[PDB]
Amino acid sequence: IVNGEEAVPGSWPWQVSLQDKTGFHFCGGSLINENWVVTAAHCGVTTSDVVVAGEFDQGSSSEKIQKLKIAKVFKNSKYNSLTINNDITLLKLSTAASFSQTVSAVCLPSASDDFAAGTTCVTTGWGLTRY
Amino acid sequence: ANTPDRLQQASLPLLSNTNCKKYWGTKIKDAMICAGASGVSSCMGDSGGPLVCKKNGAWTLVGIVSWGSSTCSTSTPGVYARVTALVNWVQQTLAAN
């Protein structure tokens, strides 16, 4: 996030980090319950990647996190790799996340919810702070 | 550069489709929602993470970080997967699995 700010640690407890088998962060995601993460289809997640829950400081080797294996990847079959439309994938965890002060789920909208233009919303992540 | 070690956040406004299309034109499709152009920008490593808005006091997933400016410009709209257009698929997938 460019021109964002540091979050209060643990205050976005659904935020997960998607990492390869060496620990390299390539995408974020959101817990929607103890067994499922929603992320983008273009992230290309496979069952060799892992879901890291409870993280704040990726440079702290001591921080207490849950590295969770992925049992199955459900890429929306209508994801359009040309137009980028329908850009969503679900990850089913092989072992449930253990919810806690720093790990819990985001709510999901109903299909009919109207979120008005101009509403102040928030986005979070470990992406670049400078391109 | 390299990514920050510590989790970042930014507040930002949802944009109407009409205002988003003033920049991105017909690249904006029906399962996309735009936000930002407000001095902040999602950027590489943010993809797949949340865009949340409060609904009756509870943070609710409205977008998934998807794509945008190829240099993460903070004056152009960021584009997010529109979760209301995709949540029926989410619920069906959970129910079946």
Partner: peptide
Amino acid sequence: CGVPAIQPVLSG
């Protein structure tokens, strides 16, 4: 869901 045990602080 959607209610963090640790409240976020946003400069707004």
